[PDB]
Design a protein around this ligand. Structure first.
Ligand SMILES: CS(=O)(=O)N1CCN(Cc2cc3nc(-c4cccc(CO)c4)nc(N4CCOCC4)c3s2)CC1
Length: 841
């Protein structure tokens, strides 16, 4: 290698937070073979990307402008405001105009074309052949009552993005030699055995057990477990899953390796413990903690895989199976039906997930017939893209690489607008891949190299997982390293700045927790220590400026130390505020960020992103629900950052006004609060209208996800009427519609009014509109639980969103379901709100 060629790698190791060159925790060479594998997909994407459009990364959509934004143009004329140091003219522009064309109506409208329209305040450009209607920044301004302010400066140089030069019919059998752990102690002595499973996509093909033996710190069986499955009948992606019961430990081993070879030889595998189903259970990884883990010891000593029309009455039996939801379990009779009529099931793309479940993967001849099936893929290829259907095929139920590859194909037709909607969940879906190198891993590599925005979020998603998941940190680390070797030095410099900042502040965050009592109030001495510490960073430590991880447009600047504080409450988070580092910004307002150790922010990332998916769904049906799904990025273990929505107060603090007698509650307070923060009555009626959409928006979304039983403390509202929930980390009421919310709507329990008629309307409008995407939400929710929670019931927890999206029902019945739910919040009123307080003391 070279001298500075190793300084590059230690730069990579610091942005990843993991050493990919390490081999202390591998029993073969898959990860290093996957570093080499991905060089090609990287150099292909890097080489065929437009340098100019990659530097400016225009954020752009092909979808139609919604109905609720075409009304904000009653005139077919939109207002842009081009700038230059001081002076700045206003240019009249029809929505169908184009970046090039609105420089033609500027220079010619005065009485050389190597200038560019950058946005005031941000690293966001309006460029490339697209209508201004079809730029996201523009749509964001039209949606807010804001006006499009734009500065005119020289394009960023592609030079700064330059990437550096790179560099048998025998049955299967396994001897369980024995297990071994340095120290086990609990209290009483029990017995112990080892269970061995040939597993393919959460489907046991075959299972044998050892005799039991007394659980000493070394148990030796020296026993062959002879299976029934033949070596030829083993499918690629099958896992030998070794588990210990007395269920205390587990570990997996791909029986067929990344090079198609059958697995052979001696293996001492270090095992994962079970904390007192999920995606950690499927991992080919081994416990890196060698000094404290249990270890199994085994031996393989066993290469491979080298007309007629239906009676109308069965067809209806088959169609009814195909109509059902992704969780409705398939009977043996259902599966045999799907499979006997493979070719008719193949005419329906929605049948695919259920059809490839009906395959017996533990038979060689039937897999080979399945590959014959996939070969004539004329209807699947021609069909319209279904994201939920595609996602279904990338979940834990499918480990066949070609089943999974036909799904990733469908994804390649997604534009960047849609990739960013599902990026986090596609990254979590890499946990379900049997092999480190996979079509999905390379799809993400490709899409983040092609677009800096996707590239940026791909970084923080991968880095989130690497930092807090031993089960998948090695794999993701190899994926991330591939990305950082191709994103170009402009972005590598950007990431280095961000990683430096957030490691400075998480230092300050955890150092502040300790000094303050476990819980009581805030020391005067602690507010002194926070100021001193941030004045000691501000000077000779902190970057002049850093990109805001959750909003990569905004470049934060120096700290506004006067407005920074420790937060009086839940695990001493840092309320930090920053100056904006761009001097063409049209505002003196600060970038607010909270830094919190304590809560599992991965869970918030996940709920917030589903919230953004529900916003885009409502886009397809001309509905806006005013949701404020703010930025939140997990950066490590029970730690991360959060976006501070400006001018927002907690609904509980609005009721603490005076006294707040450990739980006094009063109906009319919210409405009076909304009129104080309104200078006019005109802006107050604009706030109530905002509260009707926002309250309705979080009401529906929260019922669907089953996170609607919440304290007033975890629900906020802006000075301008926009309600929103916060903090999604882990008698009943389906959602929060307290009597105070209804008094804004002009209704005090068991009555109706014009504003409440609007709310009821908007709710069912939103509830029916989400049900048109039932399969999407069921499958995202199911995946959310598997990759983003503790241990869960792979039937029972998911079954909520079935009953909540009232599956199998007609539209009328559904409207009734949700309207009953409103009348449960109006029957109980303050009962459940009051109930928080009572438990405590
Ligand atoms: C005395 S005090 O210190 O001045 N004071 C007391 C009252 N609080 C209330 C708040 C609590 C809270 N919690 C989270 C949070 C917590 C965990 C996870 C998540 C992520 O989903 C968000 N996020 C918040 N946001 C700030 C506004 O923008 C939205 C985010 C808030 S605001 C302000 C601080």
């Amino acid at each position: 290698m070279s001298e500075e060629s190793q300084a590059f790698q230690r730069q990579l190791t610091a942005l990843i937070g993991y050493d990919v060159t390490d081999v202390s925790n591998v029993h073969d060479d898959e990860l290093e073979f996957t570093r080499r594998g991905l060089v090609t997909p990287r150099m292909a994407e890097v080489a065929s990307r437009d340098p100019k459009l990659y530097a400016m990364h225009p954020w752009v959509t092909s979808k139609p402008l919604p109905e609720y934004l075409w009304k904000k143009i009653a005139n077919n004329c939109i207002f842009i405001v081009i700038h230059r140091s001081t002076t700045s003219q206003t240019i009249k522009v029809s929505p169908d105009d184009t970046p090039g064309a609105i420089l033609q109506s500027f220079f010619t409208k005065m009485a050389e074309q190597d200038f560019v329209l950058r946005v005031c305040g941000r690293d966001e450009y309006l460029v490339g052949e697209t209508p201004i209607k079809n730029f996201q920044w523009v749509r964001h301004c039209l949606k807010n009552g804001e006006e499009i302010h734009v500065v005119l400066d020289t394009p960023p140089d592609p030079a700064l993005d330059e990437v550096r030069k790179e560099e048998c019919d025998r049955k299967f059998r396994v001897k369980i030699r024995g297990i071994d752990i340095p120290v086990l102690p609990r209290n009483t002595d029990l017995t112990v055995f080892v269970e061995a499973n040939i597993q393919h996509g959460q489907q046991v093909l075959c299972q044998r057990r050892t005799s039991p033996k007394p659980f000493t710190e070394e148990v030796l069986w020296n026993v062959w477990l002879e299976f029934s499955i033949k070596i030829k009948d083993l499918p690629k992606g099958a896992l030998l899953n070794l588990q210990i019961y007395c269920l205390l430990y587990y570990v997996n081993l791909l029986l067929i390796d990344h090079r198609f070879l059958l697995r052979r030889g001696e293996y001492v595998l270090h095992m994962w413990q079970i904390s007192g189903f999920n995606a950690d259970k499927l991992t080919s990884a081994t416990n890196p903690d060698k000094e404290n883990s249990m270890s199994i010891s085994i031996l393989l000593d066993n290469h491979p895989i080298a007309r007629a029309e239906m009676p109308n009455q069965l067809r209806k039996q088959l169609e009814a199976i195909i109509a059902t939801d992704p969780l409705n379990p398939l009977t043996a009779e259902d599966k045999e039906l799907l499979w006997h009529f493979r070719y008719e099931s193949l005419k329906h793309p929605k049948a695919y997930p259920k059809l490839f479940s009906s395959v017996k993967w533990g038979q060689q001849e039937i897999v080979a017939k399945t590959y014959q099936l996939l070969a004539r893929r004329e209807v699947w290829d021609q069909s319209a893209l279904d994201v939920g259907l595609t996602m279904q095929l990338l979940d834990c139920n499918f480990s066949d690489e070609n089943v999974r590859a036909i799904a990733v194909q469908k994804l390649e037709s997604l534009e960047d607008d849609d990739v960013l909607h599902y990026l986090l969940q596609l990254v979590q879906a890499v946990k379900f891949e049997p092999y480190h190198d996979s079509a999905l891993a390379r799809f993400l590599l490709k899409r983040g190299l092609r677009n800096k925005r996707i590239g940026h979020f791909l970084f923080w998603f991968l880095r989130s997982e690497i930092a807090q998941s031993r089960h998948y940190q090695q794999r993701f680390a190899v994926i991330l390293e591939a990305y950082l070797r191709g994103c170009g030095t402009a972005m590598l410099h950007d990431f280095t700045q961000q990683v430096q900042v957030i490691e400075m502040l998480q230092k300050v965050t955890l150092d502040i927790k300790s000094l303050s009592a476990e819980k009581y109030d805030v020391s005067s001495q602690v507010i002194s220590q926070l100021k001193q510490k941030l004045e000691n960073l501000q000077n000779s430590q902190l970057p002049e400026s850093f990109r805001v991880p959750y909003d990569p447009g905004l470049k934060a600047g120096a700290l506004a130390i006067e407005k920074c504080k420790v937060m009086a409450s839940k695990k001493k988070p840092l309320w930090l505020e920053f100056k904006c580092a761009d001097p063409t910004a049209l505002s003196n307002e600060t970038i607010g960020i909270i830094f919190k150790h304590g809560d599992d922010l991965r869970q918030d990332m996940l709920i917030l992103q589903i919230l953004r998916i529900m916003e885009s769904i409502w886009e397809t049906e001309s509905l806006d629900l005013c949701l404020l799904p703010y930025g939140c990025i997990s950066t490590g273990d029970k730690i991360g950052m959060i976006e501070i929505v400006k001018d927002a107060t907690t609904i509980a603090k609005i009721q603490q006004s005076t006294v707040g007698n450990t739980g006094a509650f009063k109906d009319e307070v919210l409405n009076h609060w909304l009129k104080e923060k309104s200078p006019t009555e005109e802006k107050f009626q604009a706030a109530v209208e905002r509260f009707v959409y926002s309250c309705a928006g979080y009401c529906v979304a929260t019922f669907v996800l089953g996170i609607g039983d919440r304290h007033n403390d975890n629900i906020m509202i802006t000075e301008t009427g926009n309600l929103f929930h916060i903090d999604f980390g882990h008698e009943r009421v389906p959602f929060v519609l307290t009597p105070d919310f209804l008094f804004v709507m002009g209704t005090s329990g068991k009555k109706t009014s014009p504003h409440f008629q609007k709310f009821q309307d908007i709710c069912v409008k939103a509830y029916l509109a989400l049900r048109h995407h039932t399969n999407l939400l069921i499958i995202l929710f199911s995946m959310m639980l598997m990759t983003g929670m503790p241990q869960l019931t792979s039937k029972e927890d998911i079954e909520y969103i079935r009953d909540a999206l009232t599956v199998g029902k007609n539209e009328e019945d559904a409207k009734k379901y949700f309207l009953d739910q409103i009348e449960v919040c109006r029957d109980k009123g303050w009962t459940v709100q009051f109930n928080w307080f009572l438990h405590l003391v």
